[PDB]
């Protein structure tokens, strides 16, 4: 059972602007996603200080980067606090309405796409390199859910029947045909060392066959 939703008009406007605008510094998507994972790990660590039982779904706090050349996917896994169904559908989009408005006024004022994180909508930088994005997430107070969007004004949400995750978020980037450079180990190492060197959680870079 798959539910289809329409993005808010401002979010769809931001996505199409990210997909259509000519901009070569595409590597900044990895900094935003890792930064998002770092915030989710911070939130579950703080909540667990006043409630140790919130770590019963997993004690490890880490981030994993997993490239797959066969499927042409780049996956960012974190064991953070995760997102509920309400987050995926209306909560995160309501917050992002003001950040999108402010971000686009700055763009016409002289700003560039690389400061998208300062407006809280850095997740959508994934569509600099992805034709489709899948998000598997599991929050302590909800079930596991699968979010997916190929832009175009709509996204879907369903109950995930895959491998149970325990707790956290998994972002699967289905890369455009000409962006396969972000599957190479030496390229991912280079971006992480340049933009995410001081993240306070272990970042493990998987390798392939
Ligand atoms: C938005 C996002 C992603 C996707 O980049 C992964 N974890 N999170 C996240 C989830 C919950 C948070 F409180 C903060 C960040």
Closest CA to 144 of 91, 70, 88, 204: 88
Query: 168 in ligand 1 pocket by Cβ < 6 Å?
Result: no
141 is in an annotated binding site: no
Query: 81 in ligand 1 pocket by Cβ < 6 Å?
Result: yes
User: Which of 30, 34, 37 to mutate to test ligand 1, by most ligand atoms within 8 A of the CB atom?
Assistant: 37
Pick the CATH number of 3-205 from 3.30.565.10, 3.40.190.150, 1.20.120.330, 3.30.1490.20: 3.30.565.10
25 is in an annotated binding site: no
Q: How far is the CA of 145 from the centre of ligand 1 (A)?
A: 14
Q: How far is the CA of 123 from the centre of ligand 1 (A)?
A: 9
The CA distance from 25 to 116, in Å, is 13
Query: 171 in ligand 1 pocket by Cβ < 6 Å?
Result: yes
Q: How far is the CA of 19 from the centre of ligand 1 (A)?
A: 22
123 is in an annotated binding site: yes
- SS3 of the chain: CCEEEECCHHHHHHHHHHHHCCCCCHHHHHHHHHHHHHHHHHHHHHHHHCCHHHHCCCCCCCEEEEEECCCCEEEEEECCCCCCHHHHHHHHHHHHHHHHHHHHHHHHHCCCHHHHHHHCCHHHHHHHCEEEEEEEEECCCCCEEEEEECCCCEEEEEECCCCCCCCEEEEEEEECCCCHHHHCHHHHHHHHHHHCCCCCCCEEECCCC
> What sign has the CA pseudo-torsion 203, 173, 190, 99?
negative
Residue minimizing CA distance to atom 3 of ligand 1: 36
Closest CA to 146 of 61, 62, 89: 89
The CA distance from 127 to 30, in Å, is 11
Specify the experimental method: X-ray
User: Which of 31, 137, 142, 171 to mutate to test ligand 1, by most ligand atoms within 8 A of the CB atom?
Assistant: 137
97 is in an annotated binding site: yes
Query: 96 in ligand 1 pocket by Cβ < 6 Å?
Result: no
Please check whether residue 67 is in contact with residue 188, taking contact to mean a CB–CB distance below 8 angstroms: yes
């Amino acid at each position: 059972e798959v539910e289809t939703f329409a993005f808010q008009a401002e979010i769809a406007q931001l996505m199409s602007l990210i997909i259509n605008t000519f901009y070569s510094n595409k590597e900044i998507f990895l900094r935003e996603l890792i930064s998002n994972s770092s915030d989710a790990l911070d939130k579950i660590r703080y909540e667990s200080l006043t409630d140790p039982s919130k770590l019963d779904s997993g004690k490890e706090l880490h981030i994993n980067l997993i490239p797959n050349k066969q499927d042409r996917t780049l996956t960012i896994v974190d064991t953070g606090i995760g997102m509920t169904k309400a987050d995926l559908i209306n909560n995160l989009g309501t917050i992002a309405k003001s950040g999108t408005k402010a971000f686009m006024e700055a763009l016409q004022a002289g700003a560039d796409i690389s400061m998208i994180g300062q407006f809280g909508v850095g997740f959508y930088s994934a569509y600099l390199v992805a034709e489709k994005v899948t998000v598997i997430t599991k929050h302590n107070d909800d079930e596991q859910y699968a979010w997916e969007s190929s832009a175009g004004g709509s996204f879907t949400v369903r109950t995930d029947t895959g491998e149970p995750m325990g707790r956290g978020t998994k972002v699967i980037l289905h890369l455009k045909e000409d962006q396969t450079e972000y599957l190479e180990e030496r390229r991912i190492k280079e971006i992480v060392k340049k933009h995410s060197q001081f993240i306070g959680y272990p970042i493990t870079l998987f390798v392939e066959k």
